[PDB]
Amino acid sequence: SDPLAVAASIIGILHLILWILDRLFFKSIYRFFEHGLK
Amino acid sequence: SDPLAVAASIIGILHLILWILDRLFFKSIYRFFEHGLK
Amino acid sequence: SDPLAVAASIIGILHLILWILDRLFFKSIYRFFEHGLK
């Protein structure tokens, strides 16, 4: 009886996991790093 | 009835939106990197 | 009395600590930078 609390748990896991994963994939690190670096 | 909880949710949404958007956009990565590097 | 709330707490502490240590730790920065630079 607290969707807000559930919102906190789901957004927390989604946030941390989304971050690390977004970082590791294949060449994301080098793709974004080189893209931003002209 | 729970500003604290609302603080958690709003903080999360703002966190993800600012993180992603700030990261991309008009070659933001280069703007932040050049800002810290004077 | 609130696994959901308590769970959230663990996620936050784990998030901050994981972030800082992940960055450091035997200069992990170089580990992630070299590994990602396949």
Add this chain to the structure above:
Amino acid sequence: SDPLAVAASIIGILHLILWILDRLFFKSIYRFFEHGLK
């Protein structure tokens, strides 16, 4: 009904602030980047 939730608020806002300030404040990116390198 979640004294821990409070800790979640301070840790979350503090986390965000730490990220932004740490990134930009005084050639910080250069400190971490040059630290992991050497």
